[PDB]
Amino acid sequence: HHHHHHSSGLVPRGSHMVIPAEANIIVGYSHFIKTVEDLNEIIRTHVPGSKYGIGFSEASGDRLIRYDGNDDDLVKACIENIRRISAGHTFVILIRNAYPINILNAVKMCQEVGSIFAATANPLQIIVYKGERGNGVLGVIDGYSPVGVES
Ligand code: NA
User: From which domain of life does this come (predicted)?
Assistant: First the structure.
């Protein structure tokens, strides 16, 4: 027996992500991860020298938004983004002052323990579906639609 509420379904206005100036964001789905420390560690060697924040949506147990980082503004943005999405096992990473290869490697490392929804510096909107127990991430709007074809 399952419970249905008419309030469930695609959330009309996608959730806009808070991306502080010059920050790069990574939004993904964790695989069998129970703590944000796993993410904090797997990307630790790639974020040295840079400022970063990590947010993780614990999907059971305490069901708390978990976080780590070395920059208050980035950490707060990650927490807010996780709150807006409100979907179990979602993780959000924000990195600033990092070279291109470090950002790319951070993403590759996340792919070892999860799936990627977004990885960009562009304005970003997360399309979410509101279900019974919580939400689910259906996709993202990364930047804009094309305006033409290159010559
Ligand atoms: Na999808």
Answer: Archaea
